[PDB]
């Protein structure tokens with residue numbers, strides 16, 4: 001029915017007595033997904049050989065050779081456990097004991113203990129899986145984002161809430177989120193300047209303009225586009241303030257989309273109005 | 277069927293918007309046995325009052341008042357969470373939000389996250405539960421002992437393997453385990469000096485003698501007794517070398533028992549032989 005927590009004890013054959021010659025032991029330990037295995041030795045004493053060729057206790061996790069332990073104390077070519085802690089790479093860990101044909105001294109083998117352990121994905125690896133807040137739990141983790149933001153479909157990146165602010169004043173200011181700091185990733189901002197009939201809106205790119213532009217592809221990454229009831233403008237990208245735009249419309253919509261990477265600082269617009 | 281891992285998110289009513297007046301919220305979070313709850317705030321902003329009387333977020337674990345959180349920053353009489361981490365005392369934790377009748381400023385409440393977590397009984401508390409080796413695992417722990425020792429019935433203390441060494445030489449030395457260091461707890465040592473018919477064994481308490489003795493009860497704690505086929509000797513306890521014992525036997529048995537506490541260094545005996 002319900003599965004017991006994974007933990008146990010591994011020893012050399014006949015422990016605490018001496019271990020024999022021509023012996024082989026192997027254990028394949030497996031934790032649930034989201035869990036890894038913690039292993040350590042309370043006792044260790046084997047035959048010393050170059051690269052631990054003769055007798056050895058090897059720890060592997062799939063293809064990765066985690067350890068090859070021999071002797072009593074570590075050398076420049078051989079390693080002894082001591083009270084060090086060994087962790088599996090993933091939920092799996094294989095432990096193998098081997099002895100050759102002879103043992104000059106009565107080497108007394110090993111005693112080691114293991115237990116399943118929750119992987120803390122929030123502290124593992126400077127390569128944070130979460131854009132804003134990381135939340136760890138037994139056998140998993142998830143991301144959240146701060147105020148004015150929402151968790152993206154990818155369950156990691158945090159998109160800004162920068163859509164649906166309607167401007168109705170004769171003049172005002174628009175800007176990418178966090179301006180003049182780098183605008184957030186995978187965000188879709190929608191600005192709507194709606195004025196009464198008889199007015200014309202004018203847009204002025206002020207201060208700074210830094211939307212991600214890469215060579216001979218124009219703006220396939222981040223895109224700043226302008227739409228009126230008469231025409232379209234954009235996509236505007238680059239590092240130079242775009243020229244003044246005198247729309248002959250009382251309603252103007254500005255859309256700003258971003259990709260998955262970049263530290264570009266964005267844009268800022270001052271809009272004004274004139275009468276007929 | 278199978279129970280999901282315990283984790284979740286708790287917020288003030290209407291979060292991220294302002295929280296209202298005359299509101300009350302309560303959550304009783306419970307982890308499995310051997311697990312505790314980890315709680316932290318990503319957001320916190322409440323009304324400040326003396327000892328957080330008006331509005332508050334209180335954290336309790338049974339009877340223990342873990343926290344009473346108010347305001348924005350901590351004072352000398354009030355506390356704000358910040359990015360501090362709060363742990364439950366046991367598998368249970370109650371979280372209570374309360375607001376009074378009025379809020380002068382638009383206080384915007386809180387956002388907090390929680391998750392179940394394995395209690396590490398081996399690192400918790402200088403009051404180690406295990407005598408020798410402590411081994412932690414998900415939802416529990418157990419003890420083991422080093423070589424020459426075995427785990428006692430109490431699953432914690434480690435008794436010495438000091439029984440059944442037969443002496444057959446004309447002379448030799450006996451001693452409490454780890455002598456001249458403090459003898460182990462809850463141990464039962466049995467020494468057997470067996471010689472051929474025609475010999476008489478003599479016992480000499482040498483060097484030092486320190487068996488736990490407490491006033492006017494003689495030796496009810498640790499007991500060193502001697503048995504021959506003619507009589508008995510002991511129990512010997514105290515801080516003075518006991519007098520020489522000339523047994524008229526070729527077989528002598530010495531039994532040494534210990535209790536659950538003490539740093540007494542024990543005893544050492546030199547036995548010899550004479551002919552008829």
Ligand SMILES: *[C@@H]1O[C@H](CO)[C@@H](O)[C@H](O)[C@H]1NC(C)=O
Pocket residue numbers: 041042043044081082083
């Ligand atoms: C661990 O530490 C103890 C105490 O320092 C030492 O006696 C022992 O050799 C070390 N290594 C192992 C494998 O126990």
Ligand SMILES: *[C@@H]1O[C@H](CO)[C@@H](O)[C@H](O)[C@H]1NC(C)=O
Pocket residue numbers: 317318319320357358359
């Ligand atoms: C946590 O730390 C951040 C960054 O220093 C800070 O802005 C915030 O006020 C702190 N407290 C909470 C509850 O987030």
Ligand SMILES: [Ca+2]
Pocket residue numbers: 021047054055099100101102103104
């Ligand atoms: Ca060998």
Ligand SMILES: [Ca+2]
Pocket residue numbers: 034118119120121136137138139140141
């Ligand atoms: Ca996890």
Ligand SMILES: [Ca+2]
Pocket residue numbers: 212221222258259260261262263264
């Ligand atoms: Ca970008």
Ligand SMILES: [Ca+2]
Pocket residue numbers: 297323330331375376377378379380
């Ligand atoms: Ca209030």
Ligand SMILES: [Ca+2]
Pocket residue numbers: 310394395396397412413414415416417
């Ligand atoms: Ca535990």
Ligand SMILES: [Ca+2]
Pocket residue numbers: 488497498534535536537538539540
């Ligand atoms: Ca004692």
